[PDB]
């Protein structure tokens, strides 16, 4: 965590470009006196989002064979626009904070587990991430009464069924196909 890491990410240009916005350069450094080109936004439903590797705050070092470590903002946009259909990026990032994985046992109340979900493949809740997220916890519901499950939590598994890269519909189906006592694997940020 916090340690610098490097990654090769190749993207195929969609109808709406590569699906990310950038800032920085020697023109207007984004962090102090650091002239690096930074990802500021991952566009929902775009190429970078579907590929799920690129992250906000990644520094682009190379675009194909073009060195963008110390260039202007304009020279960066040009390099990306001119890179063709298949774009080879070499990036650097500080490793993100690790998440707490936790198994939670819930007994249904009169109205179920007491929480709602969003996310899924082709229905991303955060751009670049196919995970199933908790979006609402119902007042006085089972989850609320437990006190562990929170907004923004990830559901990784329902009993023995994993929810890694599944459709939203499949996540709802897994939660429905349960008995009264449900075991959930959850990730907390
Ligand atoms: N491990 C290889 C590949 C790592 C890599 O992707 N290198 C960067 C710069 S050190 C690069 O120029 N990649 C884009 C390219 O394929 O030319 C190397 O030593 O160059």
Numbering used by the authors: 58 to 246
Can you quote the paper on this entry?
The disks large homolog 4 MAGUK, commonly known as SAP-90 or PSD-95, is very abundant in the PSD and, in rats, has also been found at axonal juxtaparanodes adjacent to nodes of Ranvier. Knock-down studies have shown that the PSD-95 protein plays an important role in the integrity of synapses by anchoring receptors. The PDZ domains of PSD-95 are all class I PDZ domains, in which the ligand is the C-terminus of the partner protein. The binding cleft for the peptide ligand lies between the βB-strand and the long αB-α-helix of each domain.
The crystal structures obtained are in the same tetragonal space group with a very similar unit cell. The PDZ1 domain binding cleft is ordered, but the PDZ2 domain shows disorder in both the βA-βB loop and αA-helix regions. Weaker and more diffuse electron density is encountered for these segments, which is consistent with disorder around the PDZ2 peptide binding cleft, including the GLGF motif (GLGF). For PDZ2, the binding cleft is linked to the αA-helix through main-chain hydrogen bonds between Leu 170 O and Ala 200 (O-N distance of 2.9 Å) and Gly 171 and Ile 195 (O-N distance of 2.9 Å). The αB(PDZ2)-βD-βE(PDZ1) and αA(PDZ2)-βB-βC(PDZ1) can therefore form in the absence of ligands. It is likely, therefore, that GSH effectively modifies the surface of PDZ1 such that an αB(PDZ2)-βD-βE(PDZ1) interface is enhanced.
